Symmetry: C2
Subunit: 241 residues, 2 copies
């Protein structure tokens, strides 16, 4: 083999790109391995797995040193098979918390959720300081570590802040806003996350972006959130509606 | 809504997947969601487009055991929802972390128990794939992440976005080996099944590092550790390298 890594689990695979959990045999350290195979011909399927893997590695290298961004440990190619070795971030993805009344526990949850958004906002701001927009911020990309700190997992969608593209990625909770660019895309996603951290999954999917103000008011009646916090999110969500 | 969402499974290309329950019957369901203009790919297919194509494929394959049934689909404003039956069981890729490394000086009884299990599983996938081809559909994306092993040991496939009519002439890469150049029709899925025959017995590290030129060597190495009928492995090595 000639490989210092041993793959122990297969996590997911899509569009010719696989993600695996492994071990550096030289040190026993836990790693994540992302692999990609080239795809030739037809530009209408745009960008193969190797192109997207190279872009993710570039974004991760521009964001190096930021806590909450996985470090690039290694990268190599076996023929045309590209390998990307990342650090393994421990913890749970934020979407797995939505699957699982005591007034003490309501208040304990409210503080917990605000600390998560606040850590995500601080992480997102550090990323903007490097000149990068994250673009794909939502509950499936947010990792909650055991010490309650946060991290982001997939950086394929990130792009330089300079790059002014009207293309804007849609949120699981609300429709994507039309003409936002730069850090305003991440500004919009963070606003949606402030509502989403308190809405039930069923309500999250059904309710449209026009009902944001009503949703903020409903949250403020059930949770001890400072009321302006929720209203600013509803304002940011409806700034163009 | 007659459905209550209990878990958020994944989100990609503007489309979310959720596990839920029909409140009228308590049945376990899967809910896939899409909003227009979301997930806009370079071919112009947005998330609603892929959801409609997946529903079409699942409706062409209705009644086939191993293909999830379409339970419901509706639109709230412009919000498209697709309700599918929940396939019980485990994804085949989750066995490579437990029903694999323990077979390093291995128990020969457990080696044989895994070998029989793997050949049963692979045979069920072939039977399902044949039913799908008889229905006029190519699956295109057959690999260990799309295969469900149900509690009674029968198999199923989960994701049908990549499926297409046998006619559609215009190949997706496999997790173990590169996709072959000029294959079309049912030969695409025939190649995926060949790769699956090796992948069920190779360790994950060897699977990813070794290329399809080494198929014959891999088949020989499998036969030294596992009591696999050698013709099973030889047909896979031939199908994988038939164009080299
Ligand atoms: Mg909306
Ligand atoms: Mg909604
Ligand atoms: Mg379910
Ligand atoms: Mg069906
Ligand atoms: Mg390989
Ligand atoms: Mg190959």
């Amino acid at each position: 083999a000639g490989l210092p890594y041993r793959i122990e689990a297969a996590l997911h695979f899509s569009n010719g790109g696989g993600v695996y959990a492994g071990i550096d045999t030289r040190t026993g350290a836990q790693v994540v391995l992302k692999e990609a195979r080239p795809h030739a011909g037809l530009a209408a399927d745009g960008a193969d797995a190797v192109t997207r893997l190279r872009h993710e590695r570039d974004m991760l290298q521009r964001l190096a040193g930021i806590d909450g961004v996985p470090a690039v440990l290694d990268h190599f190619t076996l023929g045309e098979h590209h390998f990307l070795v990342l650090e393994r971030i421990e913890g749970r993805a934020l979407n797995t918390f939505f699957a699982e009344p005591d007034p003490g526990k309501i208040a304990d949850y409210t503080a917990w959720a605000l600390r998560v958004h606040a850590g995500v906002e601080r992480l997102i701001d550090a990323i903007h300081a490097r000149g990068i927009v994250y673009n794909d911020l939502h509950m499936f990309n947010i990792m909650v570590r055991p010490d309650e700190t946060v991290a982001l997992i997939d950086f394929e969608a990130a792009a330089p802040l300079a790059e002014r593209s009207r293309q804007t990625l849609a949120n699981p909770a609300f429709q994507a806003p039309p003409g936002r660019y730069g850090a305003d895309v991440d500004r919009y996603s963070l606003a949606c996350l402030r509502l989403a951290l308190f809405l039930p999954l069923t309500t999250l999917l059904v309710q449209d972006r026009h009902k944001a103000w009503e949703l903020a008011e409903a949250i403020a009646e059930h949770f001890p959130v400072p009321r302006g916090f929720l209203r600013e999110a509803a304002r940011e969500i409806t700034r163009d509606l």
